Design a protein around this ligand. Sequence first.
Ligand code: A1AGQ
Lengths: 302, 303
Amino acid sequence: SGFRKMAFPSGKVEGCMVQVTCGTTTLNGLWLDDVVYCPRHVICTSEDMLNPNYEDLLIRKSNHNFLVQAGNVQLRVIGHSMQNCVLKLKVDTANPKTPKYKFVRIQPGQTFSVLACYNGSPSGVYQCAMRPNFTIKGSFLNGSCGSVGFNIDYDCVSFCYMHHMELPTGVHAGTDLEGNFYGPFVDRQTAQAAGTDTTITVNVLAWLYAAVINGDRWFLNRFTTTLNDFNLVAMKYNYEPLTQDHVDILGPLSAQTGIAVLDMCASLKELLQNGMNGRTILGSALLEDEFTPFDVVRQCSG
Amino acid sequence: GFRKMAFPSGKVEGCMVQVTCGTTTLNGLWLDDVVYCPRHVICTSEDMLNPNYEDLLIRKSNHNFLVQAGNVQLRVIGHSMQNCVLKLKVDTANPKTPKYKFVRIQPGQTFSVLACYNGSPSGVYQCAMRPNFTIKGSFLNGSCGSVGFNIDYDCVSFCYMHHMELPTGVHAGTDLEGNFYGPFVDRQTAQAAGTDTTITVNVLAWLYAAVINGDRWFLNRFTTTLNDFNLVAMKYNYEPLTQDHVDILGPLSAQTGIAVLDMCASLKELLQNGMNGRTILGSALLEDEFTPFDVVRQCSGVT
Ligand SMILES: *[C@@H](O)[C@H](C[C@@H]1CCNC1=O)NC(=O)[C@H](CC(C)C)NC(=O)OC[C@@H]1CCC(=O)N1C[C@H]1C[C@@H]2C=C[C@H]1C2
């Protein structure tokens, strides 16, 4: 208790959502400056989807085959190209609502806000974490493809995810805005499975730091560990190994609490090896792994 | 498959402004030519324990209120007070004003909160009005005047404006007519709420959402009467389930083929036996901040 999944305000992204239709297939696109970005599978029929030859499908398309609309207002397409698994449609109008933006490729464990959209119209916004197996636990229905994930820093929207597909287990897979899938997945209506997932250690550590900030610190011990020794133990409990970048992003919380990252790792190691022994942290017997260090600082300090 | 989802916040973002009086800054809501904000913006340290708001406000002038929309100051040309909300008339209409209404929500209903600081939106999340008229929010210093809302088609229904945090860490505020939800008062005192209870109809809605997403370990072959369920519910500090609630749950019952009173028998077993390590939709606790409409709207893709 005290913490909750908080999305970024979605208005700057709402002002970029359009719909893209090829034939009877409509999905969402992202309109930035004079380009619309969308999943390339908009060009597929039902039949093309098992083993689509995207290069051949696209060669048969022309600009005038793409219906791009902001609401019910058509946006004329003046060029088209494919970049990995995304289609880029050049349009004749620069989006007047284009925010300051960048395209970023996030790492597992990072969280982002999803603006779920259908027919170019936003339905809802929620926070997702990229799992270590490169899937997200979204809420996506038919027509949701092309919905995007993003973070906002100062005036700037960092787009990090575009939605493409649902796996058999009900989790979701997609690309960055350069069209490169997160994980090993491909945009084909074939049998694909996510890898066995693991716990996001860096975020559990952030959660333990949050607990300390809130005065809940019974699990702190007098010991430390090396990063390698911790990582070898963590893997035995299906926790992800830490990277150097993870150590770095815990820096601010380590400084705020005075607890060295490797000392907190030793405390987590003891929790893994001994369990909670009927105790709670921040009111729960379960350790949370979907709040990043940035999320904690956002909710603890503003 | 099922997530706590807020409404897209853009229509509300376009209405948020900063309001300053003295050394106090908070947020206001700019609709047409009026800015709505919490009246405690006019209080100082010497006033806040027992503020005679009518007396404090008559001593202020229009120019004591600094309203800023981004990098632009809005000239206040009049002011009035309605319960705990101040209404600052400005000389400029907001062209981003959405179609809107002001509503007062009932306990157990949900809404989205756009948390703002210094007139700038910072985050969006879904909340419920608790049975004890608090909200379990995430609000820091400077968040007052942040609003809660629902969206239907093109129309924003504003239902909450933020005023205060209680010692337990929950939150209290008003509707957009300035009337508090609950027994709280806009004075600088530690205030306790009445005993909270769990929103039973919402727990049932969420158990249906779990079944929809293929989670069904908690179902059983038994049933209960409505009254016998309610006796147990009350014992566990759960709200009573009314026949209207049963009716409201019909579409979810029809979808999953599980009678409402059969789901009540499952919930009764969970209350008496616990979850014993298991989780439902990733949660170790029974979740009560999804309404039946929220579950349906998210299983139907409404925009
Ligand atoms: C907005 O102006 C602000 C929002 C608060 C700030 C912290 N988190 C929020 O959501 N509202 C206030 O500061 C109000 C103003 C009152 C209504 C004139 N007061 C408020 O929220 O007070 C909260 C603090 C912290 C918890 C608590 O019990 N309490 C009350 C004060 C009064 C007594 C002295 C200090 C504590 C106890």
